[PDB]
Design a protein around this ligand. Structure first.
Ligand code: NI
Length: 341
């Protein structure tokens, strides 16, 4: 049964609620982004209206085979009427196709659902600037002050400089990057661009990438692994055994691997600056964990919420334990007392 924090009151709508069967009274199912915890339940057998971005809609049709007649893509930044209710989709600064949804309820209440997001000051000049929000359904993934990490731009600067140095010292080095979902494509695209290479990958990942409306993509990716010196592999294979095995397959073209694991936050962020990050190494194999986040840091989250001044906050992440819920509620009251709303 569908939990309360996935229902939008005063409407027929649910958000990211596909794993509960037929939800009583739901006339439209919104999907914020194509990540498995959120799409869980969609398939070619789904027969209700799904509302989403264009990019999310391309993934639904090609990857999950949802029929075209039930996919309702909406443009961003544009007022749309859905089943009698005004809605707007806004870029969430998460993975490709990810949105927040603004719902203008018939009774005058305004609700923002962030989906998954990485808050940014640029959001303070979207269509959110123009009016008050009563209720915020908030991505609280990293809602505690210990969660710190660098900007995405600093992380990519580290990755490009690391890769370019290594391959310039050794032209026979291969670069490998882990993946297990959409998102974080800048990691492997920025490294391939500095090296003058396309990114090589499986047919299933190439397919996924072809759904993302990235400009000039045919120029940047390939399924011909022998033509590329940046390869993508499943995240599970980014370890010494899995990389040894991959190197065997490359027909003696390479004698070294430098590999990247983009994670979210890890406890090494408590101690080590991005600049000082070092790899784990075994023989001719080195692995870097890099903290490329597509969720808000604590400080980014707090800035956004203190600017928005919502009347009520409903967390959408870390909701299963009393300790988590009580911690989150304490920070929300601090933020409110400090800013004066
Ligand atoms: Ni996500």
């Amino acid at each position: 049964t569908c939990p309360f924090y996935k229902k939008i009151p005063g409407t027929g709508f649910t958000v990211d609620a596909f794993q509960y069967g037929v939800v009583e009274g739901c006339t439209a199912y919104f999907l914020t982004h194509f990540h498995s915890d959120h799409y869980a339940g969609l398939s070619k057998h789904f027969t209700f209206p799904v509302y989403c971005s264009e990019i999310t809609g391309n993934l639904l049709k090609n990857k999950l085979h949802v029929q075209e007649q039930y996919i309702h893509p909406l443009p961003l930044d544009t007022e749309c009427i859905v089943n009698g209710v005004k809605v707007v989709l806004l870029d969430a600064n998460h993975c490709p196709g990810a949105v927040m949804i603004l719902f203008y309820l018939p009774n005058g209440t305004v609700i923002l659902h962030t989906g998954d997001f990485r808050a940014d000051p640029s959001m303070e000049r979207s269509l959110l600037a123009d009016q008050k929000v009563h209720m915020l359904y908030l991505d609280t993934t990293y809602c505690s002050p210990e969660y710190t990490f660098p900007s995405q731009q600093e992380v990519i600067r580290f990755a490009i400089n690391t890769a370019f140095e290594a391959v310039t010292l050794n032209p026979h080095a291969l670069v490998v990057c882990g993946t297990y979902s959409i998102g974080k494509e800048k990691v492997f695209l920025a490294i391939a661009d500095v090296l003058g290479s396309k990114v090589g990958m499986s047919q299933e990942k190439y397919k996924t990438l072809q759904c993302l409306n990235i400009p000039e993509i045919n120029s940047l990716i390939t399924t011909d692994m022998c033509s590329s010196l940046v390869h993508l592999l499943p995240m599970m294979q980014i370890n010494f055994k899995g990389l040894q095995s991959h190197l065997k397959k490359c027909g003696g073209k390479y004698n070294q691997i430098l590999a990247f694991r983009p994670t979210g936050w890890t406890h090494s962020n408590k101690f080590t600056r991005i600049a000082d990050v070092i790899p784990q190494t075994k023989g001719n194999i080195s692995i870097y964990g890099i903290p490329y986040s597509e969720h808000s840091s604590y400080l980014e989250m707090k800035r956004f919420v203190q600017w928005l001044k919502p009347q009520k906050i409903i967390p959408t992440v870390n909701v299963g334990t009393w300790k988590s819920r009580s911690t989150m509620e304490k920070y929300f009251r601090e933020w409110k007392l400090e800013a004066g709303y």
